[PDB]
Each structure stands twice: as structure tokens, then as C-alpha cells.
């Protein structure tokens, strides 16, 4: 696992700061903050306004989020810069205290990539609660890449990409901080996710890997968005955030929590918005940037993906 100093940011600090927002407070003076990292094709509010923003507030936290432009569709390595910057700011802004990070979809890959290549935030992140993370990417993006209808981050989130290869070779498939990964075998966006083993894309060694069906049975069905918004997900998430070990505890949930519908504590308005969470993301992808090659790895990641090919050619140290 990489150690020492953090790589330099490619983006100006002012640009990175502009992508960070907290509810009812400034990052420089915030009480009990939680960092929310959005999924592909969305902004912070679009991913969590109908779910974990009001839910985390009820848990006593001040929700903060990043919204890397455009709609998390650009280079994952740059999206990670926004998170690394946000963690540094919130840590100091909360009185030099560790803070929890809650993510969805790409947000999980971004978090784990940051913990792997930016050693300084490792002592600043209390725990990681990732919903439907794609650490090994997804095999479903392949056809889209071939037709050149994939945004930069979709290329990188494709199984076998130079970025996912770099994460694995750098030791990023093992948990770095106390991590809980909640996912579903019936995810229509991220696959493979069916084996309930290391083969799954959401699996991290030594982490608390919770495949919904392993707990609720083969008849339990929640999709990519459901993995984040369901009542089952809320119970598992609340367990992870309250746990003294930093990971969700099996003793906190059971079969009676296996409710595929949006979290019960959400208002009717929020429940409807949560059910249609994937709609805004799909529109962003249809109207967003598209290219015919995977973004080049930055200098610090190149040694871990030698032989792979990116937009400029074959990767070398
Ligand atoms: C989207 O990602 C690309 C690639 O990382 C960014 O482009 C780089 O930006 C830095 C800083 O301005 C430049 O030094 C590099 O030369 C750029 N590289 C390429 C290949 O363009 C870009 O800034 C990002 N855009 C947004 C809006 O996040
Ligand atoms: C007459 C039969 C009614 C069956 C109702 C099943 C309701 C479960 O539907 C659930 O809706 C959630 C919100 O969109 C999704 O996130 C879940 O994936 C889905 O399983």
C-alpha cells in the first residue's frame, strides 16, 4: 500500500473548494460533519436529497457533500481530489476530529482510491459506509465503451480498466479504514455481484461485506438505487455509523428489516423522489461527455498498471 506524502493536486485549491457544501454551516466551522460522495451522473443533492441528507441529519450529523463537475462524469482521479480536499477541510473545521464518509456507486471507488494514494486522509476518516461500490468496476460498461458513448469515469469504471487494475495492484482491494459495503446481487448497473464472495465488485478484504440477499434471502430484490435508499439499507447504515468497531454489526439487523421500499423515516415526498433516483443520473449520462478511450492515469498510479492502454497509449512507470 502506498505511503509517505500525498501526490500534488492537478486542480487549483479554489476550484476544489467550490465543489464542497455543508447543510446550514461552513466547512471551516461545522459540528459532527459527515461527508457524502455522489454516484455517477449526479451532484451531491441529486444523490442524497431524498435519502441520506435528511436521514444523517436525524442521526445528529451535519451533512456535507461534494459535487465534482460535470455530474461525476469526469476523470475519477480528479473527482477524488475533491474528496481529499473536503476531508482535510472538514477534519480541521470540526476541531481536528475524524469524520465518517458515506458513499454511493462511484463515490465508493473514489473514496477507496483516495485512501490508497493519499496517505494523509487515512488518519482523518473515521469509517467508510459504501452503498453499491464498484471497486472492480462493472462488466456492463464494456459495450458502451466500444460504441464510444461512455464518459471518462465510465471508461475507468469498466472491469479491466487501467484505473481498476491500478487500484488492485496498489493493494486497494483490502479495507484501509473500518469499512461496510452494502450491495445487492440483483444490481442492474454493477456486476458481478452475485457470488457473495471476493469475486463481487463491492467486496473488500477484512471489510464488513453485506450482500442484501445473504441476509434477506434469494427472493429479496433491490436495485442499484435501492441499495442506497431502502429501509434495509438505512438499518445497515445506521448500524455502521453507530458502531464502536466502525463497521456494521450483524446483531443490529435481521429479517424483519428486509424492507425493499424507501426508508420509513422519509417523508412521502422524499420517498417518491428516492424511488426515481436513477432518472436524473440517466439523463446526465445521455447528455454528458463521451469519448473513445480511457483517461490517462496520473504519474502516481502509472507504476501499478504497466502494460494497459489509455488515451495516450501503453502505460509505463
Ligand atoms: C476533467 O479531468 C481532466 C483530466 O484529468 C482535467 O484535465 C486536466 O486538467 C489539469 C488542470 O487544469 C491540466 O493540467 C491537464 O493538462 C488536463 N489534462 C487533460 C487530459 O485535459 C480537467 O481539468 C477536468 N475537468 C473538470 C471540470 O473537472
Ligand atoms: C402487487 C405486488 C406488489 C409488489 C411490490 C414490490 C415493491 C418492491 O419494489 C421496490 O421498490 C423500491 C423503490 O423503487 C426499489 O428500490 C426496489 O428495488 C424494489 O424492489
Curated annotation (Swiss-Prot):
GO terms for biological process: lipid catabolic process. Disulfide bonds join 22-64, 216-258, 293-311. Glycans are attached at residue 74. It comes from the Eukaryota. The active site is at 105, 187, 224. It is an enzyme of class 3 (hydrolase). Keywords: Cleavage on pair of basic residues, Disulfide bond, Glycoprotein, Hydrolase, Lipid degradation, Lipid metabolism, Signal, Zymogen. It catalyses: a triacylglycerol + H2O = a diacylglycerol + a fatty acid + H(+). Hydrolysis of triglycerides. Is very stereospecific both in hydrolysis and in organic synthesis and has a potentially important application in glucolipid synthesis. This is Lipase B. The lineage of its organism: Eukaryota, Fungi, Dikarya, Basidiomycota, Ustilaginomycotina.
Amino acid at each position: 500500500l502506498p505511503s509517505g506524502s500525498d501526490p500534488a493536486f492537478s486542480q487549483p485549491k479554489s476550484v476544489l473548494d467550490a465543489g464542497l457544501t455543508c447543510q446550514g454551516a461552513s466547512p471551516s466551522s461545522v459540528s459532527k460533519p459527515i461527508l457524502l460522495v455522489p454516484g455517477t451522473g449526479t451532484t451531491g443533492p441529486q444523490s442524497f436529497d431524498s435519502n441520506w441528507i435528511p436521514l444523517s441529519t436525524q442521526l445528529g450529523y451535519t451533512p456535507c457533500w461534494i459535487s465534482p463537475p460535470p455530474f461525476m462524469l469526469n476523470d475519477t482521479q480528479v473527482n477524488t481530489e475533491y474528496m481529499v480536499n473536503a476531508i482535510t477541510a472538514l477534519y480541521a473545521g470540526s476541531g481536528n476530529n475524524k469524520l465518517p464518509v458515506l458513499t454511493w456507486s462511484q463515490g465508493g471507488l473514489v473514496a477507496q482510491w483516495g485512501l490508497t494514494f493519499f496517505p494523509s486522509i487515512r488518519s482523518k476518516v473515521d469509517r467508510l459506509m459504501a452503498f453499491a461500490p464498484d471497486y472492480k468496476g462493472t462488466v456492463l460498461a464494456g459495450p458502451l465503451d466500444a460504441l464510444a458513448v461512455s464518459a471518462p469515469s465510465v471508461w475507468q469504471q469498466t472491469t479491466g480498466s487501467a484505473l481498476t487494475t491500478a487500484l488492485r495492484n496498489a493493494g486497494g482491494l483490502t479495507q484501509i479504514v473500518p469499512t461496510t459495503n452494502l450491495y445487492s446481487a440483483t444490481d442492474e448497473i454493477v456486476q458481478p455481484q452475485v457470488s457473495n464472495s471476493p469475486l463481487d465488485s463491492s467486496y473488500l478484504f477484512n471489510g464488513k461485506n453485506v450482500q442484501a440477499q445473504a441476509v434477506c434471502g434469494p427472493l429479496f430484490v433491490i436495485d442499484h438505487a435501492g441499495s442506497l435508499t431502502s429501509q434495509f439499507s438505512y438499518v445497515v447504515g445506521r448500524s455502521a455509523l453507530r458502531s464502536t468497531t466502525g463497521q456494521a454489526r450483524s446483531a443490529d439487523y435481521g429479517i424483519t428489516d428486509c424492507n425493499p421500499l424507501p426508508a420509513n423515516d422519509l417523508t412521502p415526498e422524499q420517498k417518491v423522489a428516492a424511488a426515481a433516483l436513477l432518472a436524473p443520473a440517466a439523463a446526465a449520462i445521455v447528455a454528458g461527455p463521451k469519448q473513445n478511450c480511457e483517461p490517462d492515469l496520473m504519474p502516481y498510479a502509472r507504476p501499478f498498471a504497466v502494460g494497459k492502454r489509455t488515451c495516450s497509449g501503453i502505460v509505463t512507470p
